């Protein structure tokens, strides 16, 4: 406890994503609408504009 702030212990957590999005499995929070065909629309399949 008497050590300086420089030598105080720190907890480090490192996250490593894989944005090559081949299977996609850990998709974040959102909500899914229906699918319509043969109409120029804005699609968002798996986070792709």
């Amino acid at each position: 406890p008497t050590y300086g702030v420089g030598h105080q212990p720190y907890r480090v957590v490192v996250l490593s994503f894989e944005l090559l999005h081949a299977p996609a499995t850990v998709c974040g929070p959102k909500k899914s609408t229906n699918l319509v065909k043969n109409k120029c629309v804005n699609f968002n399949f798996n986070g792709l504009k």
């Binding site: 907890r11 480090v12 957590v13 490192v14 996250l15 490593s16 994503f17 894989e18 944005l19 090559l20 999005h21 081949a22 299977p23 996609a24 499995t25 850990v26 998709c27 974040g28 929070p29 959102k30 798996n46 986070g47």
Partner: protein, 50 residues
């Protein structure tokens, strides 16, 4: 630090707002992706180090 551990996070729904809020001072400087847009994206595999 020399024997560092890995935990596989898969098949779940992430929520990064909790990490945003409840951690008092947590640096969070990130590489290759904007932190504020981590909610929309989809990830192949997420691994955790400690």
């Amino acid at each position: 630090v020399y024997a560092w551990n890995r935990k596989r996070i898969s098949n779940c729904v992430a929520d990064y707002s909790v990490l945003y809020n409840l951690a008092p001072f947590f640096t969070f400087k990130c590489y290759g992706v904007s932190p504020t847009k981590l909610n929309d994206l989809c990830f192949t595999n997420v691994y955790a180090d400690s």
